[PDB]
Amino acid sequence: ITXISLCXPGCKXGALMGCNMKXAXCNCSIHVSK
């Protein structure tokens, strides 16, 4: 993007992704460990 403002959210916040933001503990099965 031009980068005059919020350089990044627009980098993929659009049809290029749909704003993913996923993968925040998707494999976080972690509980007590043992």
Place this chain on the structure above:
Amino acid sequence: AXKXX
């Protein structure tokens, strides 16, 4: 302009 959004 670069409507990435």
